[PDB]
């Protein structure tokens with residue numbers, strides 16, 4: 085197929101149009117994944133005084149600020165009984181006009197609900213990677229993308245107009261399911277329509293576009309602070325994506341695999357018509373297609389079954405869980421640092437750009453494993469130190485969270501490369517999917533861990549730090565891949 089894709093033009097005039105269009109949605113993946121930092125921000129809440137009759141009606145904490153979850157039973161002038169606040173809460177409207185937290189009183193006893201919603205969105209992301217991955221192999225990378233643009237648009241719009249919390253969570257799970265399928269199918273449709281030598285470039289562009297999405301969330305959230313308006317704005321473009329996605333060309337590779345070379349030929353000729361190498365497309369017929377593509381024409385149980393591939397599976401699963409679990413833990417707590425939540429989102433997104441370069445340098449220059457111990461251990465040390473250092477120190481805490489997020493971004497880049505290199509060709513793609521699945525399990529478990537803040541304010545961070553420190557110790561077991569050719573059989577893994 086690669087000989088044929090190259091026959092039909094060289095990365096020119098279709099691949100440029102379609103890849104631009106298929107990677108444009110990814111800009112708003114960051115906006116959706118981390119949308120709750122802005123759509124669910126917690127304004128300062130203090131209890132509403134009884135209407136019958138704040139200094140007299142609000143108990144004060146050590147800080148001298150009014151206590152969030154309690155109000156005095158009787159008016160205290162100048163040990164007073166404290167009742168939970170039946171009459172609701174008054175929320176500061178200086179920074180956040182409305183958030184899901186203000187709208188549904190997800191405060192005090194129901195504070196965990198704010199994180200349950202993030203976990204549910206991510207349960208949707210895990211489910212969608214699986215459902216839409218199967219559906220794409222059955223119905224096409226394109227048809228599944230068209231339906232996913234419509235689902236994200238409809239679910240996200242309906243979430244913005246959700247009348248109650250259960251409904252917002254349902255439409256956020258479905259938003260995530262669709263978005264998981266968009267992220268997968270954008271990779272498959274672009275990679276399969278692009279030459280093998282350029283495959284790495286496609287993958288990197290997809291990563292950088294997600295990072296630029298972070299700056300998009302910061303700029304958009306500043307402009308549209310209200311949550312219903314911000315959720316609608318971030319889900320509206322997907323309708324426009326759905327409208328132009330009808331003109332995408334289905335992967336000829338998927339057509340060949342299905343058995344329908346008639347559609348492989350039709351796609352290859354259409355692309356020739358676009359790339360401008362028409363003559364060369366006319367030459368392409370079915371006697372030419374059957375020839376050469378002829379040569380082109382294992383189960384996850386294997387990863388567990390073989391002891392050699394089970395060791396590589398377990399170790400890498402710990403590495404993918406840890407990086408995601410910690411990364412989401414840090415990225416989903418922008419308010420505590422003491423700087424604006426918009427500046428911190430911008431800084432975090434601008435740390436990805438030098439992190440990815442430093443990581444590339446260390447990966448190639450030193451090794452692929454030394455980079456993973458360093459990226460994960462340093463992130464763990466930084467997150468644990470962001471737990472120990474007092475809150476008053478905003479600059480020390482911000483700088484250490486920033487460095488830590490950069491290190492976990494490098495770990496994501498290094499684990500994507502290190503994994504492919506570690507697995508044999510037979511179970512390589514299954515292994516990269518299982519690793520990504522464990523990453524999604526990390527993002528489901530992370531908000532649940534954050535709910536332990538009630539037990540101890542620093543327990544969420546101490547766990548967000550200890551898990552990457554343990555994963556760094558696991559990397560020691562994995563085998564170095566720098567300068568070694570990719571394995572083709574289990575025997576090769578074994579020889580290593």
Ligand SMILES: Nc1ncnc2c1ncn2CCOCP(=O)(O)O
Nearest residue numbers: 291292294295436493496520523524
């Ligand atoms: N579901 C996900 N699986 C793996 N990695 C993910 C997932 N969602 C977001 N990411 C991170 C994206 O790549 C790492 P980057 O933030 O440096 O681009």
